[PDB]
Structure formats: structure tokens, C-alpha cells
């Protein structure tokens, strides 16, 4: 009856760039979502799945925690049916998605005096992502009829772009640590309960 290691995600000392979310599997443990819900530390706690007050009593075969950092305004893009630079080129939720999205204001930790440029996001892609698709390639993006020779310069862009995160940024431009909890029921006995 070991407690699920949520501290390995929410209390983590390092977070992934939005172009490459760091997924961790949660299994064979006792979940507690009420501690997150009632911490009142989160700027947002919203669900598209079962309401969080009932979610704790519902068992699942697999739970995934995907951790990453985005601008506070970008948080609105993380929902089923949404479009935008993050929703289409970095990560996408399915229309049938069950789960919750939790956001926390990290400006006190992720900001740096010279600015924090260690977080990247994908700016270019040939087509929209499939739900839960992840792409870590760094190949140069072609933006024209002329074949790209793989050398960055003109209509040959590095697909990733750094964030301009700074301590003086307005709230919409401040970094937020965001965790998305995905839930599924496979044809197996449940291993995660609360």
C-alpha cells in the first residue's frame, strides 16, 4: 500500500522543455489526489475527466504523469479540441481524453536574472501532432519549395525556439510548471487506487 511517488514529479528539481515532455509511469501504488486538490498551491486545477473529488475513489490500470514548463497564457491550450502552437506542435490531447491538468507558478524558481533560456518549444512542424505524439528530433525545418541542405540559414530553421522567461515578465509570460495526469482502463486488473 505504498503511496504513489507524486513527489518525484511535483517536487522535482528539474523540468522538461515543452517540446519533449518527460513522461513518468504511475503504477502498483496508492494514489492521493486530495492532497493536491486541497493544497491550494496550484494556480489551476481542472479536469476533463471524472471530477477530482470522485477521482480519488476510482481505480485505474495505468496513470501517466507528463511534466513540462510553459508560459501561463499557454496553459489555456491544454485541453481536448484546442489548437495553437503548443496544442498542435508540442503536445495534443484526444477528444476522448480522461484526466486532469494542474498548473503551478514557477517564476520564483525558474526565473534567472539574465533570463532563463534553457527551456525550448517547437515553433515549426510540417503537420499537426497525433494525440500523445512526442517528437524529439532536431532536424532542420524546410520552409519552401527549394530542398533544404540541412544547413540552417534561410527557409531552413532550427525547429525549436527558446523561451524569453524573465523574473520581470507579466504573469501571462511567467513560466508555469504543469503536470498532466492521463488515465486509462486497459483489459487488466487495476493497480492504482486512492
Amino acid at each position: 500500500t505504498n503511496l504513489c511517488p507524486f513527489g518525484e514529479v511535483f517536487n522535482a528539481t528539474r523540468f522538461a522543455s515543452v517540446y519533449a515532455w518527460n513522461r513518468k509511469r504511475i503504477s502498483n501504488c496508492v494514489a492521493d489526489y486530495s492532497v493536491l486538490y486541497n493544497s491550494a498551491s496550484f494556480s489551476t486545477f481542472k479536469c476533463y475527466g471524472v471530477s477530482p473529488t470522485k477521482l480519488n475513489d476510482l481505480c485505474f490500470t495505468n496513470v501517466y504523469a507528463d511534466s513540462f514548463v510553459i508560459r501561463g497564457d499557454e496553459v489555456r491550450q491544454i485541453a481536448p479540441g484546442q489548437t495553437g502552437k503548443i496544442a498542435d506542435y508540442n503536445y495534443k490531447l484526444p477528444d476522448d481524453f480522461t484526466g486532469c491538468v494542474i498548473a503551478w507558478n514557477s517564476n520564483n524558481l525558474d526565473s534567472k536574472v539574465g533570463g532563463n533560456y534553457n527551456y525550448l518549444y517547437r515553433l515549426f512542424r510540417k503537420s499537426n501532432l497525433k494525440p500523445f505524439e512526442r517528437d524529439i528530433s532536431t532536424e532542420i525545418y524546410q520552409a519552401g519549395s527549394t530542398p533544404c541542405n540541412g544547413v540552417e540559414g534561410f527557409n531552413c530553421y532550427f525547429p525549436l525556439q527558446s523561451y524569453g522567461f524573465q523574473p520581470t515578465n507579466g504573469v501571462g509570460y511567467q513560466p508555469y510548471r504543469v503536470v498532466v495526469l492521463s488515465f486509462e482502463l486497459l483489459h487488466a486488473p487495476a493497480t492504482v487506487c486512492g
Partner: antibody
Amino acid sequence: QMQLVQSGPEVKKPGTSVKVSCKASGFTFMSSAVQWVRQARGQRLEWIGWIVIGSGNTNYAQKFQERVTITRDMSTSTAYMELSSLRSEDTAVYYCAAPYCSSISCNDGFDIWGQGTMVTVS
Amino acid sequence: EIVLTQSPGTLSLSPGERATLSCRASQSVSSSYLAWYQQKPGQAPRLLIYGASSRATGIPDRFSGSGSGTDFTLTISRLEPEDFAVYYCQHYGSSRGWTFGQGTKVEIK
């Protein structure tokens, strides 16, 4: 019909700055980089620098290094350029230019140019 | 930086006459990005050829680019009265480029 619309003529004193705008219409601004060039009367075109839209990459020609700044406002689909420490030598017509296509940025050339902005320093 | 040189600086041709403009790189310029432009006084430059080998959309068949390596040219099969203009070329390169050549002027003879 694709258009680029630039701010009208402006006169500045030497040692002061000037700001020039260029607004896109009929085209997704995010689909392409915008570049700037100037032409003094009777002279050949001289490249200043460029900005990749949505990337913030603003590398400049060495001749204008730390003498020009290029920015963009995504909400107005408008490119901006500023010059500092102006000299009477800088009197010229300044132009913005871009590629034009729809969803795929297919054209590698510069299909659309603005009407140009006259800047006089004296 | 890539420096381009063009010749003749001034040309004099009759209407209906075939015309050629030439450009040469100061150094072994990479690939082919020598796009060509046309300009009239009081007006912005307009794209004719991109890739030094392909016509821009809406460009008449008489215009065509050519050449390779350091040596690039622009040709017009026959000059129209409308075609008398100042011409330029630009090298997009791998960035840190986009230098323009000195350009050429074509006058009516």
C-alpha cells in the same frame, strides 16, 4: 491581395533615433521572416538585417551591428525597425519585404515589398 | 561576406533586342540563391527570378535566369519598352549574407 503597408515619411535630427513600421495584410505573419533594406538616392540597395517571425532571431549585417534594432508585434502582424545614432549619411528610403504563400510558405523569393519609408536626417 | 560584382554597369539596347545581364561572385559562392529583381524610380524592387533558375508567379516567359558557381546571369529573350529598368541580384546563402550586387541599368537605344 497581399499587401505590405509602411509608415509615412519622417524627419529626424542627427544623433537621435527613428522608428519605421511595416504591416502585413492578407497573409499569415507567422509563416515567414521579414527583411529590411535601404536605398540612398542614386545608390545601390544596401541590406540592413532581418527578423525571423515567431523566432525572435534578429541577427544584423555587420555594418549596422548595434546601430539597428528589429522587432515585431505578433498581435498586429507588424514588423518594426529602429535606427540609432543617425547621421545625415543615413538619409534614404527604407523598405520591408517578405515571401508570400498560404499554409506552407512555398515561395522562397520575396513576393511582396512595401511602398517604402523616406527618412531624412538633418 | 559574399561580395557580388555586376556588369555592364550601364547597357544600351533597342526595344525588341535580346538582353543579358551578368553577375560574378568575389569568392566561391555556395549553391544558387541569386534571385533577380527589377526596379523603376519611385517604386519598390520586384522579384523576377528566384533560385536564379525559376520564374516568380506572374512573370512573363521572356524572363529566365542561368549560370552556376561564381557566374550567374539574367536573360530576356526580347526587350519590351516596359523592361527598361534597374536590375539587382541577391544571395540568400546560409544567412549572414543577403548582400546585393551593384546592379545594372538598361537604357533605350
